[PDB]
Design a protein around this ligand. Structure first.
Ligand SMILES: [Mg+2]
Ligand SMILES: [Mg+2]
Ligand SMILES: [Mg+2]
Ligand SMILES: [Mg+2]
Lengths: 284, 442, 442, 284
DNA sequence: ATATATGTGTATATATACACACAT
DNA sequence: TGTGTGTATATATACACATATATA
């Protein structure tokens, strides 16, 4: 019953629905027209997200855009969001040469698509029986050919694709703050359920075709290598784009976020009470 | 420390009356000729000033609406921002006078994004219909940098559609299609039966029917198979926020309908399937009436054509035909002013050009020798002789590289060719030139 | 669909360590030379752009800001207005670089009016202190229209007091007296032991004492009778709102004092009548300490001199006078660069003027027969491939009031005067020019 | 005890104590430094004032500004204002060369002041004993001088001065709306306790001499008489220098408001819910 | 062992008036 | 009797960053 939540038609059902947390009402105005009406959502945040590292699960649920996100997605703090199934059987897919060990209920990638292994069992393909104790989690998780089937979940949106402005504030202050908030469930960054929707920060008009540069750093690596560019700096995600919004939504370039082994150390150094770790982190 | 007893009737006679008249004339009611409230003419004046160097440059709305206080805007710049943001889009504009880039709003979200982002510039429609911008009337106040009102070719007040509220009087004019207003103006120019313009809404696919003054802006629905319907267009009044929560929410949490969203890029697409608890029947007429009543697919609008005429006084019109007929007559006396001004300007320009050609043709030969002189004796000798004094500044204007060849030819060519322009301006009438200027609107 | 993979370590090392070293460099942490944060620099650049037409005209703070978007400030215009309202004050700035018209704030209420009222222009201090703008370094980005940093004669960063916060790094510099900073700069120029500048707060009548490197700011209280006291001054950190409701209302609700207000022209003037509940020990030291501690008339502060050097890198200093000794050393180079550029420009101007005089003398003597000759081959002729071949267009581009003897001598006089100015510019040095420029600041 | 109240130290005591009402917080900043410091109040309003006419007292005390004003001065809606003592005696004198009929206890203006008959009894000027034959109480009530005295007042401030900005909106929409609100206590108007501080709207300087124009009409009535002037249109009271604000406050040009017999009929036309009355009144 | 504040930055919201034709 | 539109008046609120005093 959130006021600004733009619900999807299939939100709450079993589908590849997506949430589209922006960082303002302005950036979401063009979403309701160009989004897929079956699997696409949207909730505008309000400025910088609260730094929610180290806080208990009672002060996080006091910011407006930290209780609204929790209620819209159906996630509940302090509880496991997913529920995996059994992991008895094993199989081999042999895709692009590498040996992908899969289970009886997994989800493989086909050029960026998600298809269940159980349905793929109907056709023979390359399924080869292998023994147990072949837990090659990182081996098949590098490009995510294995997602454990969810027995039960209270998640309305089975995607939390984050799109914000590509400026420094919207890329180094709202991006990692939301990453740290969603870090409270260390399973979203395990099946590629947290995604970054890349947004052009600069559009040049070289020739008669518009050239897109997603980050300022990327732009300042071909500036004096590009012919007669008349660039437009995009500060706001949805308020400097008219039909580029439609192209970037219907033809998106996502980045699924994966947590390394020592993610806690990185988050604590970036989002922590000790300000001396950041002085020794920015100096290198 | 001064004590003055001020009777309340004096307050209401002076301060309240002045504020009421200020809201009536300079705040809400738009100009009949120009078509702008006295905040959109400020915005367009500033934006057209910003387009002096580069015509196609997009300037930030905080730069167009900002810095209008030097043009005479006595109010806050946020009002100018929200007034220049509403006139640059196309969801509510039949003839936008500002072309902008960014999120200016759509029919689903009738709210432009924050002014920090969106850019705007003067559109090509303004340059296509707003002529004689240098012949526009000059306002009484010295601080009012923009003119009293611009001079369009067709009445813009009927195109975009206006709605203003002031103390005592209020105005509401529905949008009218450009191709019909142009036809009405062309018919009024020659003198004929002025065909009334047809009301057309921007980005709207429905049916605007008029019975008697009232308008019956409608929508469209389509029964998919037997119970599922596809609302392909809602009336023009409705947003997406105040149509889900106004007619679609208080029809789902009541036991009547279950609706979904299919509002594609075409427009509004609220697919709706009725459950068992409904009173729809097999009769087509009753079903149609109930569907168009419950779902709010019919909106009613009646124009209140109140405009500030060329004299600065409020005026109420019965129909748009009278507005076009009066506006044509008002603009036909400004086309004549253009003719007179062009005649005088071309005469004054040809005289200067002929004087310049004479000076080049008589100095190169060696009659008016300027060697070994000073400023005063040259300015006196050229002033004592005729045909030269009235343009005595002309002595140094042509610069050294005109005292050569390939310049006397050019200098004489300008003087010879300016008579073509002068003769053209001396034969064209108001009707002919107005008809010529009306054929460039496309 | 272009699903890629991005590790968290690659996110917080490329995109988080690009906002961390953006809030430090391109935000907060004022430049050591320029004296401004980027927002202040953009605001002053736009103010200079406006003052180009007229430097005595007040523009709205919605016009002083707002127009900085095209100058390269893509951070919203409300922040620019708020940062420019903090620069036109006299209660907050010991050396304002913007003059203001309206309510920009007072010490009692440290909040300027809304931007709809207040006007801002460039102050006389900026013109007396900031020189060599045309020789200031240009930014790497082409969009950054304002220079990399302006070049003042004195370190303005140690003039008004700054407080900046950023990811990892913070800076706090107290306001220093202008007359002492100027003396320190002059001593650093001439070369000798430099006397450290003293800390002075604007519109403050109290005491500031150096203890163990700290700075303690104490107000003054007097006793008009046994049970009556006058609080003549309070520490600078306080307002009327946050001193009445943090130190005074506590005491009033606790039944200790009764305070009357006298916060008028002479700052804060609270008059306190004590009660029998409040102890009034006769010992002078104990009574003074109790009054100072209870009434919050003592405020201790310590500096944190973090700045950005001439290479755009963070630099942390320890002593108060260790930025002057570096700012002077660096600015001597930008004075020498000005001297060299002025030498080159004056030589070029003198050469052009001499060529102009020579060409005029030749053309009035018949050497260049402009008459009866086309312009192109005239340019190709003796006007080119001669002594004045380098500026042939300029001579071709001369106008008529130079063949006369009145201005033919004027051209020669200007040619002789530009050479005299070049003689000045070669017979001068960095130290002499900088110490001559420092004398203008009284 | 509201937050934005610059209370005078002699508020709850008998003195010439004034409450200063502005339309915003920006018009108050320079008042705190140019006040009398013993007899001056202050409370910034918020924009336009809610239309008081025709409202029940319960709905009257729901707008935050109206409730704050009612709680600041000590006025109460529904109960009449300060009471008055008994009258009937007459002590007419010859002040300012005229027969001014005065009761045994009033307040008499000598020159911009307030002195009472009780304190006038000890200054030895002319007293003429007059019987109760005369009944023309309005002969002295219409003017500011000779007003009824006070025996018990619940009003914290002894004066209410509406200091709004002299632009069109300030004098046209907000001033004759606080006037309509304060018309609930006509005893305030009778005693000359509702004043308007005449603020400039146009301070235009010619050479070195400044000219203060309090209304646009006065400027337009003298625009073609002054020499070449650089007009400084001050939109609000927050656009004024401290010297001009101090001169305005400490040298005030008041305008005491006095209601006529038919004030209700001339309020119903401007504030009532009938636009035809405004139509007929404006067309004249 | 916490609380506060200081100044650039990220987004946003509210109460109020005015009128006249639809919808109750 | 009640929202509703568009130009005006005035104002407010959450979050991030660090570090050096006041407080617990
Ligand atoms: Mg946004
Ligand atoms: Mg951003
Ligand atoms: Mg006002
Ligand atoms: Mg004001």
């Amino acid at each position: 019953k959130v006021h600004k939540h733009i619900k999807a038609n299939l939100c709450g059902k079993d589908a590849d629905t997506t949430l589209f947390l922006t960082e303002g009402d302005s950036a979401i105005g063009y979403l309701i027209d160009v989004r897929d009406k079956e699997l696409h959502g949207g909730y505008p945040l309000r400025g910088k997200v609260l730094n929610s590292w180290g806080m208990s699960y009672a002060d996080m649920l006091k910011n407006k855009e930290l209780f609204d996100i929790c209620a819209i997605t159906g996630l509940v703090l302090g509880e496991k969001a997913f529920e995996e199934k059994e992991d008895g059987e094993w199989f081999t897919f042999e895709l692009n040469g590498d040996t992908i060990i899969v289970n009886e209920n997994d989800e493989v990638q086909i050029n960026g698509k998600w298809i269940t292994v159980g349905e793929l069992r109907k056709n023979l393909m390359k399924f080869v029986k292998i023994d147990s104790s072949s837990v090659d989690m990182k081996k098949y998780k590098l490009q995510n050919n294995v997602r454990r089937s969810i027995k039960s979940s209270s998640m309305n949106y089975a995607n939390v694709a984050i799109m914000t402005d590509a400026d420094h504030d919207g890329l180094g202050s709202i991006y990692p703050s939301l990453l740290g908030f969603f870090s409270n469930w260390p399973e979203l960054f395990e099946q590629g359920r947290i995604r970054f929707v890349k947004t052009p920060v600069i559009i040049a008009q070289v020739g008669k075709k518009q050239e897109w540069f997603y980050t300022v750093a990327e732009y300042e690596s071909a500036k004096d290598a590009l012919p007669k560019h008349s660039i437009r700096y995009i500060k706001g995600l949805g308020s400097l784009e008219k039909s580029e919004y439609r192209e970037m939504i219907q033809n998106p370039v996502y980045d699924v976020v994966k947590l390394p082994e020592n993610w806690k150390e990185l988050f604590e150094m970036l989002m922590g009470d000790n300000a001396d770790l950041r002085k020794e982190w920015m100096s290198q | 420390m001064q004590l003055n007893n001020r009777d309340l009737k004096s307050i209401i006679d002076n301060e309240a009356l002045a504020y009421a008249m200020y809201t009536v004339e300079n705040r809400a009611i738009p100009n009949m000729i120009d078509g702008f409230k006295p905040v959109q003419r400020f915005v367009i004046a500033r934006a057209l000033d910003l387009a002096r160097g580069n015509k196609d440059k997009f300037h930030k709305l905080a730069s167009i609406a900002g810095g209008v206080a030097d043009l005479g805007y006595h109010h806050g710049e946020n009002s100018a921002q929200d007034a220049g943001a509403l006139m640059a889009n196309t969801w509510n504009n039949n003839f936008p006078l500002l072309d902008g880039q960014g999120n200016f709003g759509s029919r689903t979200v009738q709210k432009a994004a924050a002014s920090r982002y969106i850019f705007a510039r003067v559109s090509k429609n303004f340059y296509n219909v707003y002529k004689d911008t240098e012949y526009a009337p000059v306002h009484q106040d010295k601080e009012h940098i923009p003119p009293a009102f611009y001079l369009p070719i067709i009445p813009t007040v009927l195109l975009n559609g206006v709605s203003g509220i002031a103390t005592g009087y209020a105005t509401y004019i529905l949008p009218h299609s450009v191709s019909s207003v142009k036809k009405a103006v062309l018919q009024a120019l020659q003198g004929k039966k002025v065909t009334k313009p047809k009301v057309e809404f921007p980005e709207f696919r429905g049916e605007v029917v008029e019975i008697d003054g009232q308008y019956e802006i409608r929508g469209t629905y389509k029964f998919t198979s037997r119970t599922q319907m596809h609302i392909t267009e809602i009336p023009y009044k409705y947003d997406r926020e105040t149509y889900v929560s106004k007619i679609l929410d208080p029809l789902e949490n009541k036991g009547f309908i279950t609706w979904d969203d299919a509002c594609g890029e075409h427009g509004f697409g609220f697919k709706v399937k009725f459950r068992k608890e409904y009173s729809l029947s097999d009769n087509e007429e009753e079903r149609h009436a109930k569907i168009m009543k419950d779902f709010g697919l019919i909106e009613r609008r009646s124009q209140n054509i109140t405009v500030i005429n060329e004299k600065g006084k409020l005026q109420v019109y019965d129909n748009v035909v009278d507005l076009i007929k009066d506006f044509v007559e008002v603009r036909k006396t400004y086309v004549q002013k253009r003719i007179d001004n062009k005649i005088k300007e071309t005469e004054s320009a040809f005289r200067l050009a002929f004087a310049k050609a004479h000076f080049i043709k008589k100095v190169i030969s060696g009659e008016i020798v300027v060697q070994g002189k000073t400023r005063k004796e040259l300015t006196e000798e050229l002033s004592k002789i005729d045909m030269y004094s009235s343009y005595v500044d002309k002595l140094v204007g042509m610069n050294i590289f005109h005292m050569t060849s390939d310049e006397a030819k050019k200098l004489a060519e300008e003087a010879k060719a300016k008579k073509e322009e002068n003769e053209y301006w001396k034969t064209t009438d108001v009707v002919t030139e107005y008809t010529k200027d009306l054929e460039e609107i496309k």
